[PDB]
């Protein structure tokens, strides 16, 4: 329950996995009247660490540009090194991308990222869990129906993840 200034009570039910983080760049918006970025059929990268080297991440990015499905980047710390390059690619229609900051902080963010990976049929792609990030293949990412992102809000509709794996993680969490 939260204070609502409307004098009548209203109930809102969020659908699916929503984390309270917003687009890093206003330029990312592909639907200006909505004020939100809608990516239909996205792949999803759930990244480890701080990543301000498009410089290094490139061959993964090239493969996505050839593939032609939009992409979401979830990650911890991002310069204009990525965002202006992303604007150069997105706003002039070469590639279709958007990017958000990872929720909360710490190992709680890591535990949460694994839940997203299981849901999206994807992977926590991480040096510290044993992958060079730039080695990732297009199958190593997750996928889902459709995403919408605001300046406060991230919503993710309906994952590729295996249902028994998701139920297993829900049960493993229940433990």
């Amino acid at each position: 329950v939260e204070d609502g200034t409307g004098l009548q009570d209203e109930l809102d039910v969020v659908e699916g996995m929503q984390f309270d983080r917003g687009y890093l760049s206003p330029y990312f918006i592909n639907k200006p009247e909505t004020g939100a970025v809608e990516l239909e059929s996205p792949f999803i990268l759930l990244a480890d660490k701080k990543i301000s080297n498009i410089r290094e991440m490139l061959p993964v990015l090239e493969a996505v540009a050839k593939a032609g499905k939009p992409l979401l980047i979830i990650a911890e710390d991002v310069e204009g090194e990525a965002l202006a390059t992303l604007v150069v690619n997105t706003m002039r229609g070469i590639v279709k991308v958007a990017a958000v900051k990872a929720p909360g902080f710490g190992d709680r963010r890591k535990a949460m990222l694994q839940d997203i990976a299981t849901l999206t049929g994807g992977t926590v792609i991480s040096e510290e869990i044993g992958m060079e990030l730039e080695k990732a293949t297009l199958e190593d990412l997750g996928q889902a129906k459709r995403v919408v992102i605001n300046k406060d809000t991230t919503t993710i509709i309906d994952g590729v993840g295996e249902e028994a794996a998701i139920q297993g993680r829900v049960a493993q969490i229940r433990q």
């Binding site: 498009i54 410089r55 490139l58 061959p59 990015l61 090239e62 540009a65 050839k66 090194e81 202006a84 390059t85 992303l86 604007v87 150069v88 690619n89 002039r92 070469i94 590639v95």
Partner: protein, 97 residues
């Protein structure tokens, strides 16, 4: 025209700044990539080292280039064109393979 090329020196354009289709695919933002590649615009003709007849310079004008950016490389805007002045020895390849 400048004024003479200097002895043992070369004058090159830098080949490009940003080959902008990275991997042939992505349109790069600020790589800030100053190509180590170049194009020879002039040659110093000879090296007079060791008190001997002017040794001919290793190659010749009008080939492209690959140079080591260095203190010896000097940025000069001869006329309206940015050109780089260095010793012929500051080059690291043309085309070898």
């Amino acid at each position: 025209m400048n004024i003479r090329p200097l002895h043992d020196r070369v004058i090159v354009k830098r080949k490009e700044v940003e080959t902008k289709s990275a991997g042939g695919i992505v349109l790069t933002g600020s790589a800030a990539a100053k190509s180590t590649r170049g194009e020879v615009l002039a040659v110093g003709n000879g090296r007079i080292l060791e008190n001997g007849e002017v040794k001919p310079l290793d190659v010749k004008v009008g080939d492209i280039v690959i140079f080591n950016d260095g203190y010896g490389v000097k940025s000069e805007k001869i006329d309206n064109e940015e050109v780089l002045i260095m010793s012929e020895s500051d080059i690291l390849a043309i085309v070898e393979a």
